[model samples]
Target: GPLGSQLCGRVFKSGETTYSCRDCAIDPTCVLCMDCFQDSVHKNHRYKMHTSTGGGFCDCGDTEAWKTGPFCVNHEP
Candidate 1:
């Protein structure tokens, strides 16, 4: 099923209280379960929050082509 391929499917742990693991140290699209996050294998890795909505502004200033990527999607870069 498609459920098995989603990010949540890869990181969700129904038996764990923490639920989500940690975000990828580099990529924003990857994550691991709590067990995986605490495991010595990935304990030293960096992590980030999963934003379901909204974003911050980019550094491109007020322009029409600022667009969105690592920063806000609404305002200019």
Candidate 2:
């Protein structure tokens, strides 16, 4: 739906730099933005650049529970 389309081109930042989503092997559809990408659990997950931003279920391995995002949400800095 159009609601999901709004997430595209959206960006999250830490200071001056842009964020990248690291694709997870556990779920190829899984994508995570910057902070989540560098989380201690994800440090071993191996990541790459994610060109498009969107909403989806987050698999950043949150200590409390699985996360979902309007954009990538997990492990805040």
Candidate 3:
């Protein structure tokens, strides 16, 4: 999990939809889930979606993954 991946344990399957918040992530290692991105503040924040090629995971609740902390309502740590 040194790549800012899998700290949240929700791995992305091939072609799964994901996201990354420019307003949230302090690093490129973190990725976001659809539910978290849509229902969370990231919807209005500077964020973008990513199509996973597989093997990465969501970093929603990982405090270190974001400079703004967990922007997702469900990922508040």
RMSD of each: 14.0, 9.6, 5.5
- In model 3, the Cα lDDT at residue 77 comes to 37
lDDT of 3 by residue, 1-77 (tens): 34442335578899999988887787766778787777667778788888999988888777677777474665453
> Global lDDT for candidate 1?
0.29
Candidate 2 ranges beyond 4 A from true positions: 1-24, 61-77
Better of 1 and 3 by TM-score: 3
Quantify all predictions' global Cα lDDT against the true fold.
Answer: 0.29, 0.39, 0.73
Q: The CA-based lDDT of model 3 is what?
A: 0.73
The order by descending lDDT is 3, 2, 1
Clashes of each: 7, 0, 0
Off by over 4 Å in 3: 1-8, 69-71
How much does candidate 2 score in TM-score? 0.36
Error of 3 at 39 (Å): 2.1
Candidate 1 per-residue C-alpha lDDT over 1-77 given as tens digits, one digit per residue, 9 for 90 to 100: 23321122232333432312143223333333443334423344344434322222112112222122211222212
> lDDT by residue for model 2 over 1-77, one digit each (tens)?
23332223324443322232343343455555555555434455455555443344344443223233322323232
- How well does model 2 score by local distance difference test? 0.39
